[model samples]
Target: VKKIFVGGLSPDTPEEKIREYFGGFGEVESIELPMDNKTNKRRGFCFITFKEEEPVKKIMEKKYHNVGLSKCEIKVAMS
Candidate 1:
């Protein structure tokens, strides 16, 4: 499995959206988006686990700044 990190997220970003966007490339094993416990809003970052490493590479190469909702850039990090 490959672990990926996502940045440049809006505070209102949702986990489902992240899954939907990245899922196209590969199987999303897990997602972790920190949210304010009180207000329940995104914390501007998220972590995802992909079933394979190629999809993570593909995502970074093809869809870093290309995919977004309402001009929010979806950046990616892989390790």
Candidate 2:
């Protein structure tokens, strides 16, 4: 499995929502949201890992796309 970076997330976005969205592509191995050290808040991005590379390929095809209710435009990249 490989990790993919998902950027431009909304601060209010929840982990479950992220999981649900990406689950459409494939089984998500894990998800990590790094927080700001000083504030202990979501840094507005996350790293996702899939059981296979297919999902990564599928997601990266789009240069940008919306996620969650906020419809934040996110950038996807291989990590």
Candidate 3:
């Protein structure tokens, strides 16, 4: 699977910024940020899909990322 679980994302972060970080590993196909039902705001966690599994693997090896001022974690995604 070429997908990963990313957490610790701030509400201020933008998809383009996320792409810039993940883009280094490989082409980021898409990113899905969960939403809060109550506030309708972006959740702190999300999922990222890559064009290839290799990028996912590489990102997994890297594990932690400093995205802007927020610290994010990347892990294997389920299903």
Candidate 4:
């Protein structure tokens, strides 16, 4: 209930940047930056875990999110 699936991430996306960006929506508990070394762009992504479920709702307020050179896609996930 306190998780978010974020895709469309480039290799340039950093955890610090993700925190500040998604943190704007709610209290970020932690961030999981998945594989890219071999996973490639198709499966490369990160997941954001918040302290509250309400924050997840606020984050989805938009359809498209641009993070640096990547347009981060937000989706519902049970992390």
Candidate 5:
């Protein structure tokens, strides 16, 4: 599996959008968007897991990606 860290996301970003975007690259196993305990809101970032490394490599090659209305940074690493 390949894990990627997505940062600089808009707080209002939707999980479905994340799934849809990353899904294009490969099979998305799971998506995680952390929440703030006190505010009960999204933490402005997410973790995406893919079933293979091809997608991860493709994503990493691009310097930037636009998810919804926000453009964010993607970091690839082992989970």
Candidate 6:
């Protein structure tokens, strides 16, 4: 599994929403959408783990930027 960094998300962003957004590219083994303990909302960042490398490659190939999210941009990175 590969861990990818997802950024620029809204505090309300949900795991289902992240799965729905990234699921199109490949098989997602698991996803962790962080949240703020005080506010109990999304922390605006997440870690997504994909099942395969191909989909990861495909997602990166898209050169995504400014992914609309409740009036914010989504940035993606890999580790």
Query: Which clashing pairs does model 3 show?
Result: none
TM-score per model over all chains: 0.60, 0.67, 0.74, 0.75, 0.75, 0.59
- Residue pairs of candidate 1 with colliding backbone atoms: none
lDDT of 1 by residue, 1-79 (tens): 3656665455545667667766776787776654566666554566666777766766656444222461233345444
Give me the overall lDDT of model 4.
0.69
lDDT tens readout by residue for model 5, 1-79? 3777776576656878778878887888777765576676655666677887777777766526676665566787445
Tell me model 6's lDDT, rounded to 2 decimals.
Answer: 0.55
Regions of model 4 farther than 4 Å from truth: 37-41
* Residues 1-79 of candidate 2: C-alpha lDDT, one tens digit per residue: 3556776466545767667766776887776665576677656666666677767666665424344553332345455
Looking at model 5, report the run of 10 residues with the lowest lDDT sum: 62-71
lDDT of 3 by residue, 2-68 (tens): 8887776675457666677777767887876655766775656666779888888887776676554
lDDT of each: 0.58, 0.60, 0.70, 0.69, 0.69, 0.55
- Worst lDDT run of 10 residues, candidate 2, spans 65-74
Q: What's the true lDDT of residue 63 in model 2?
A: 26
Residue runs of model 3 more than 4 Å from their true location after superposition: 38-43
| Candidate 1 local Cα displacement, residue 66, angstroms | 5.6
**lDDT score of residue 79 within candidate 5:** 53
lDDT (Cα, tens digit) per residue for candidate 4, span 20-74: 7768767987876776576454667767778887767766664255655555667
Candidate 2: where are CA atoms >4 Å away? 38-43, 70-79
TM-score result, candidate 4: 0.75
Question: Which regions of candidate 1 are displaced past 4 Å?
Answer: 35-43, 63-79
Ranking by TM-score: 4, 5, 3, 2, 1, 6
**Residue range with the least summed lDDT across 10 consecutive positions in model 1:** 65-74
TM-score pick, better of 1 and 2: 2
